[PDB]
Design brief:
This is part of a larger assembly, with chains A (120 residues), B (110 residues), C (17 residues), D (56 residues) and E (117 residues).
Chain B: E1 4-10, H1 14-24, H2 29-37, H3 42-61, E2 70-78, E3 82-87, E4 93-98, E5 101-108
Chain C: no helix or strand
Chain E: H1 6-20, H2 31-71, H3 75-84, H4 91-100, H5 102-116
Helix pairs in contact in E: 1-2, 2-4, 3-5
The chains are: A alpha+beta (120), B alpha+beta (110), C little secondary structure (17), D little secondary structure (56), E mainly alpha (117).
The structure holds four RNA strands.
RNA sequence: GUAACGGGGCUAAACCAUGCACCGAAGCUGCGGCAGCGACGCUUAUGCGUUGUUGGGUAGGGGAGCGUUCUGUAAGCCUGCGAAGGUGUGCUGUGAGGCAUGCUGGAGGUAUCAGAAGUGCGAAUGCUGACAUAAGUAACGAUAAAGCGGGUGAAAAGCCCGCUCGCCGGAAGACCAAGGGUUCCUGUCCAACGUUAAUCGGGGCAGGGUGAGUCGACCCCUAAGGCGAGGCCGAAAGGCGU
RNA sequence: AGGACCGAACCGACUAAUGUUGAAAAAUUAGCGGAUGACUUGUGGCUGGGGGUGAAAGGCCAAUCAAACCGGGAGAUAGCU
RNA sequence: CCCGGCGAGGGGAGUGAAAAAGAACCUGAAACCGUGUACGUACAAGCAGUGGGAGCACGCUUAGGCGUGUGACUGCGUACC
RNA sequence: GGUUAAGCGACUAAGCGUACACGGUGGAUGCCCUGGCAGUCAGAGGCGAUGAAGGACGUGCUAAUCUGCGAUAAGCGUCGG
């Protein structure tokens, strides 16, 4: 019935879904922008944004937890080094989703998800 | 003025392309163009190509000023069907009909 | 356009005796 | 689990009547570029709400 | 001498189809099914060529009864008065008169009453 | 589901006796049209100024007719100012049919009387080709699993490269034996196939690729077994066997 | 030593479930019995139809067996539909 | 020559008696699938027809019906071998 | 003329049915055939170890099939038309 429950299935088991979210979050934070289906970006917000929230603070344990999540030393290095100060003054809403039509292969809702940055 | 245009031996089925054709039947050229462009169907682009061919024919082989043009007669028709044999269970053999359709677009100013 | 050569034997009828 | 008799083209058309699609009829013109795009979607060139969003 | 019957078969099929033209569904498209319709249509026409006489007699009797009851006499009494007066007019002309000219029907009714009484 | 007047409904719109009227069939009568049977007044291979009667029909029996291929008629006739087929129309005959024509067609057809049928389709769970039905429904072929970025391309989730996630790993790895015959590599394309797209392929076209004294086959010998000079046997064929 | 014991490959299909126009014209998952001997398997042959073989069920003989398949008698015959 | 994807196909031009003779190519019907026209249909039950039947849309001489299509409603009407 | 009430009452077609005009799949009918069937008139009734019928591989300027041919290989020599 799913009354008030949260968390999409995406036609994948728990392990596959968590691995997909981890990889997508890593790629998104590495490239500052990615292209993915709208449901994927909607479910990926709840994963990526807490990464930035955690990276706001700096400490040994915080670094270890940020590594345990996203399993990427380079990604955690980028965090706490550029992702922290550039959003220290922003409270929430670290990501932005822009719909970009439908994929040609299977007509799926496509949308670009990116950080609120890149004003160079 | 007829300025006919058609795409014979199209892969898309007539039953599935008539749905797209009905959307643009009797509408202005620009409205039909944008509707086909933003329609989420393969038949949408399939018939948008034919519409572009028809409007180009009107521009070049016939009178200019495509602004006052309307898609008067548009209809989708079936075409030759190709027989394909698909194995099934229990050794039974069925025949797959690769259906093709003929689409015709007629655009006139009046 | 060959007619189906092999046709499986009919399912055995239910006991109606 | 099978039809006793063949339905007619009239009933077939009546059933298919509801299969027709509906046009979007919601073409939105960009304030700056003046380009048509789906409502709440970025333009093909990459312009949304006047400001650029794709930078490509 | 081999003889091809395609032309004759097509001619007969076209004759049957044109006879059956105007029917609903496959009855006007399929020769095998349209043939039944034309035979049934002919049977219905044969039955109706007789049913029409009695149905028109029914309608005329109803009209005459209505007119007679409006004028103040029953249909049976009016017919009996006409027969006693030796009038050979029929229901069709009687109904036409009743529908169009009221004075003529009043004259008929009064003469019938005079003959009866 | 009222359901034992057809229902409505009826205290006469219920039952008995009588009478006068009407409805009531394809029954009778009035008119017109068609065909058979017998008669007499006449025509005499046929009309009847006629007369009486018959005309529901399965199996079955008798008679009279319509349609098409071909042959004689017929080297005659129509026909490129339009034949045959196709497609609608108006007449016409109790009928199978016949006539003329609007448009397509493009070069064959055939009057009247005769001769022979592979001579007339609506069925036989009939045969061949095509199209509907279900239906735009199941399904899209082990629940090992894809994402992002760049590139080509008109189009990218599946084509090429990089980082991640996952599976086999006594195999889901590498060699072969048997079995296929160029599917192997490159260039080139998405006409058809891949249960979708594809720029990709074990798909279409072109080109290249298989190097042996030491690998195997080939060759010497041979088991099971085959053939079998002569020989034995058996109607022939042929069976056994040195 | 065991026509031994538990148990891999290998052989077979005893139970349940799915699959009956299925992935497959008897298949898949887990259980299941043998797994050094009457075991199994690769290769090459022998036993050919009222005949072969058969730890024998009327079982198998190329998806067909109380008498295989192919061509002929043969358009067998049908008092039957 | 143009659209299209240096495709397929189509539209213009030309050849050709004819290109709805374009190689998926003589004549080119049916089942089947659409468009436009006129009518009817969203309170009305059943071999979907027949007889009557008002109205509407097309042309006629005359100014009324007549030729065709549709046909609400009404009595009857349970396909073929 | 307006307010209120009662009665009557068309104009709608998501789609569908009929008739017409135009389209498409489709290869039926019409016409033609160097293709088949059966005969009459005549020949002959065999081919072959001086290697038969039937085939593999090759044979052109040409990648492939048909046809003819065989390392003298779509062929060579003599004599005639």
């Amino acid at each position: 019935m799913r009354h008030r429950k949260s968390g999409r299935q995406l036609n994948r088991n728990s392990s596959h879904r968590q691995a997909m979210f981890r990889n997508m979050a890593g790629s998104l934070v590495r490239h500052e922008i990615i292209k993915t289906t709208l449901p994927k970006a909607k479910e990926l917000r709840r994963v990526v944004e807490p990464l930035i929230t955690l990276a706001k603070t700096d400490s040994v344990a915080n670094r270890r937890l940020a590594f345990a999540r996203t399993r990427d030393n380079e990604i955690v290095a980028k965090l706490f080094n550029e992702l922290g100060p550039r959003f220290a003054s922003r409270a929430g809403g670290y990501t932005r989703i822009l719909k970009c039509g439908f994929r040609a292969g299977d007509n799926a809702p496509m949308a670009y998800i990116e950080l609120v940055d890149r004003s160079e | 003025m007829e300025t006919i245009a058609k795409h014979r031996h199209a892969r898309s089925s007539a039953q599935k392309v008539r749905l797209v054709a009905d959307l643009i039947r009797g509408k202005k050229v620009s409205q039909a163009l944008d509707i086909l462009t933003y329609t989420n169907k393969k038949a949408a682009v399939l018939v948008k190509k034919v519409l572009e061919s028809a409007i180009a024919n009107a521009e070049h082989n016939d009178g200019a000023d495509i602004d006052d043009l309307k898609v008067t007669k548009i209809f989708v028709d079936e075409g030759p069907s190709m027989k394909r044999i698909m194995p099934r269970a229990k050794g039974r053999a069925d025949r797959i009909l690769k259906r093709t359709s003929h689409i015709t677009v007629v655009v006139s100013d009046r | 356009n060959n007619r189906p050569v092999y046709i499986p034997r009919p399912r055995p009828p239910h006991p109606r005796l | 689990a099978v039809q006793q008799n063949k339905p007619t083209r009239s009933k077939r058309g009546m059933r298919r009547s509801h299969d027709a699609l509906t046009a979007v009829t919601s073409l939105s013109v960009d304030k700056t570029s003046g380009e048509k795009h789906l409502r709440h979607h970025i333009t093909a060139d990459g312009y949304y709400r006047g400001r650029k969003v794709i930078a490509k | 001498a081999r003889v091809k019957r395609g032309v004759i078969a097509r001619a007969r099929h076209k004759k049957i189809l044109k006879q059956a033209k105007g029917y609903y569904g496959a009855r006007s498209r399929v020769y095998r099914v349209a043939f039944q319709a034309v035979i049934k249509a002919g049977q219905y026409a044969y039955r109706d060529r007789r049913q029409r006489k009695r149905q028109f007699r029914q309608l005329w009797i109803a009209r005459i009864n209505a007119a007679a009851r409006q004028n103040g006499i029953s249909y049976s009494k009016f017919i009996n008065g006409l027969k006693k007066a030796s009038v050979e007019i029929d229901r069709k002309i009687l109904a036409d008169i009743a529908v169009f000219d009221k004075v003529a029907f009043t004259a008929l009714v009064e003469k019938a009453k005079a003959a009866l009484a």
